[PDB]
Amino acid sequence: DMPVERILEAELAVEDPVTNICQAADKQLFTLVEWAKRIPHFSELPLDDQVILLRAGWNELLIASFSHRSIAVKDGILLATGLHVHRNSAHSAGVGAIFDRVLTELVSKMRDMQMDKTELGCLRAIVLFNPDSKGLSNPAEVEALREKVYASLEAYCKHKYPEQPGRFAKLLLRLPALRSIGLKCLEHLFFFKLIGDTPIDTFLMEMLEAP
């Protein structure tokens, strides 16, 4: 089984600007590992596959988390360090475009639909169990777990928001945006690493290593 209550529990258990964002990201990578261990069946996968899923998903997973954390923030994001970062600050640091995509495609859409923590948890678990991740010893097994998450999520939405028949599809359709922003985020991080002005801490650095 894949009970949405366990997924919610996982979320609840873990609850210039470029430098601050990068520092916050490094910090949250530790927390991400703890989150993943709390998702049903993840820790039962082979260690090598747990590594692959987390290396494949970490940036989307962190982006989804700070985006949902920021739904009551006007034109900004709330980092896990407690720091609010506004649009103007990101623009003045040369990362306005990517920052605005986060705000318009993720944060404001999460706000508009009042995406809840169960739904966020499920989307994150779907991202985690990515069966397209290269090198998985058993892709079908990860595919099975993803299928169980989205079954439970659809059941949850239909029970909790029966007057919103499109809500489930609406949730899933933020995933392409999440993927694209995740990819653009990586491009920036690789550049910061290349230029070498911004400090990149050890876990974030490791995520930027070749496989």
Binding site: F30, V33, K37, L47, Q50, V51, L54, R55, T202, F203, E206, E209
Partner: peptide, 10 residues
């Protein structure tokens, strides 16, 4: 990927 392995191990 030494950090991730160490943290997942437990």
């Amino acid at each position: 990927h030494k950090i991730l392995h160490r943290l997942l191990q437990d």
